[PDB]
Design an enzyme around this catalytic site. Structure first.
Site, short mmCIF file in Angstrom:
data_model
loop_
_atom_site.label_atom_id
_atom_site.label_comp_id
_atom_site.label_asym_id
_atom_site.label_seq_id
_atom_site.Cartn_x
_atom_site.Cartn_y
_atom_site.Cartn_z
N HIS B 41 35.83 33.33 38.05
CA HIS B 41 36.22 33.64 39.43
C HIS B 41 35.77 35.04 39.84
O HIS B 41 36.10 35.49 40.94
CB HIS B 41 37.73 33.44 39.64
N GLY B 143 42.53 43.39 38.82
CA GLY B 143 41.51 44.07 38.06
C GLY B 143 41.63 43.89 36.56
O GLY B 143 40.70 44.29 35.84
N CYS B 145 41.87 40.95 35.02
CA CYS B 145 41.27 39.71 34.56
C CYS B 145 40.08 40.03 33.67
O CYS B 145 39.37 41.03 33.86
CB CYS B 145 40.85 38.85 35.74
#
Ligand code: RMZ
Ligand code: RMZ
Ligand code: CL
Lengths: 305, 305
Positions: B41, B143, B145
């Site tokens: 993503h 942030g 991820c």
């Protein structure tokens, strides 16, 4: 979201850990520049620890008696000295992995990360607080002495603790990196008991702010209080007195959440007087006091290193 | 002595963390050999996350759209591919700090360390468990991820988790390093609720053994039970059923302490039925279930890496 007991990344410290052996005793040392720091009781046998005279014991030790091993490679000791309760072993090679660093003596209530090591090898990392009685509640076995505690500010490691001793009650004592013990403890196997382990009020309040930020708010109430009134309750429950300095330090968290510090004190007062009633706060059934206000801001903001 | 929630030393993983930017989205990647792994993503805007068609979104991306930065130096992307819910970005330079590593898909109840990162920089390290509902209770902000979870066996890092999502309830979901989500979750911003967060019984029992080893024994009683009887109580309290496999895994801790597993089950049964009565076990007022039996043996033995 979410709030966890979080330690600093340990890589910068891992690169500084070495093994120190004197005679039949092996523990950990900290290799920074061309100096290795370790507990002076590395020169003691289990029998010496009852009434050691370190100055006399050290007369019988030469540079070549301190075996210092960094991984699989031996370091050459070209000098040694005792500073308070630590030995400083001068080696002929500066640690190529030395980070930017400082030695700091922390105050009770401050938190730090511990890199637990055995035989110079890292075993794990966890977060601690310097208790108001100058103990820490760590996880240390035989051979872990010389493991260090630290904080990191971006790229500078501030070393604040070296592990020396376990008291008969299972709590731990140690020194700063100048070799001065925290609190009244000594590196002798004797009867030394810890004082009252009071709760770090300002840290509890910080953690309640963290709870509010992360969704846990059932404990917020309609009450407020004053410093003096709150401290009458704190004393009863063996909490540190709250000072205006503490209130000021909580200012940023109070501004972010819109909850006045004295209002949160009223929430804490009710939690002490009525208990948790089987509920939890950030996954805890007791009031957590090993997050500082700076820890909460840091973790809720995402500061990196 | 002492028992602490302890994470693995993070240095080997710190050397693998990089920053990945696609368009206006920045998160973390894992650089192993000449491949960077990150959540797919990263190619999404906040608007795409409602109903993303990743295959279509990816058609518009070329190697030069994935900006990969290791500290202050840029990496050259020479290929990219999607495997399940992760992207694999081929770079022209093998990570010189690549440790020995494996990719493992863990089972619910297993624990691991998380290195929380932002913009490719480590922020902190903490211990997690894969919950029985296939969530984890972590500490992740926007942030974070691409941050990974891992275990270490001496010198081999077994990566088991990459962080992808936070559910509306504040818990976290992610994938193994092959990009397959744990549990039924998907990398889409939709209504996906977590199931029952049951308690990991075998881990609670391991932690009770740890308590006995470290001095906390007030909860030991004069009772025993059977697997079937105990599990009637476990079901009532949303505990995982205890199996003979679990009993066998607890064998070593049972041998060290001399407390039969079923006797400890009887202690646990009374603790569930009567509560803690305001007492604590290893500094906790609730029953801790994110230590595995192997974690307890490891920390009580002093295994290193
Ligand atoms: C999806 C999403 C993503 C991000 C954010 N926001 C990101 C920044 N974040 C900063 C707050 C921080 N927490 C404190 O307690 C504190 C104290 C002093 C200074 C700063 C802080 C707040 C939440 C919100 C949402 C809904
Ligand atoms: C001063 C001092 C110093 C050291 C020790 N002993 C060191 C070794 N230690 C191993 C135990 C470990 N704990 C388990 O639960 C387990 C399970 C399987 C295998 C191994 C273990 C026990 C205590 C004792 C004293 C009094
Ligand atoms: Cl608790």
């Amino acid at each position: 979201s979410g709030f966890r007991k979080m330690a600093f990344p340990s890589g910068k410290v891992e690169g500084c850990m070495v093994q120190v052996t004197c005679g039949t005793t092996t523990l950990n040392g900290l290799w920074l520049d061309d100096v290795v720091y370790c507990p002076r009781h590395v020169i003691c046998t289990s029998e010496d620890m009852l009434n050691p005279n370190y100055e006399d014991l050290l007369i019988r030790k030469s540079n070549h008696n301190f075996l210092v091993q960094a991984g699989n490679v031996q370091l050459r000791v070209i000098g040694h000295s005792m500073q308070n309760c630590v030995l400083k072993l001068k080696v002929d090679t500066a640690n190529p992995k030395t980070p930017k660093y400082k030695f700091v003596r922390i105050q009770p209530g401050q938190t730090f990360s511990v890199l637990a090591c055995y035989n110079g090898s890292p075993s794990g990392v966890y977060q601690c607080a310097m208790r108001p009685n100058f103990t820490i509640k760590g996880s240390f076995l035989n051979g872990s002495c010389g493991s260090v505690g630290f904080n990191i500010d971006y790229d500078c490691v501030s070393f604040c603790y070296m592990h020396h001793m376990e008291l008969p009650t299972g709590v731990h004592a140690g020194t700063d990196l100048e070799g001065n013990f925290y609190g009244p403890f000594v590196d002798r196997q004797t009867a030394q008991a810890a004082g009252t382990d009071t709760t770090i009020t300002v840290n509890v309040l910080a953690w309640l702010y963290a709870a509010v930020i992360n969704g846990d708010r059932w404990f917020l109430n309609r009450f407020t209080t004053t410093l003096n009134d709150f401290n009458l309750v704190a004393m009863k429950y063996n909490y540190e007195p709250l000072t205006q300095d503490h209130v000021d330090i909580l200012g940023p968290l109070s501004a972010q959440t819109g909850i006045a510090v004295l209002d949160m004190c009223a929430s804490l007062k009710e939690l002490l007087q009525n208990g948790m009633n089987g509920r939890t706060i950030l996954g805890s059934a007791l009031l957590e006091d090993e997050f500082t206000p700076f820890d909460v801001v840091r973790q809720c903001s995402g500061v990196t290193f």
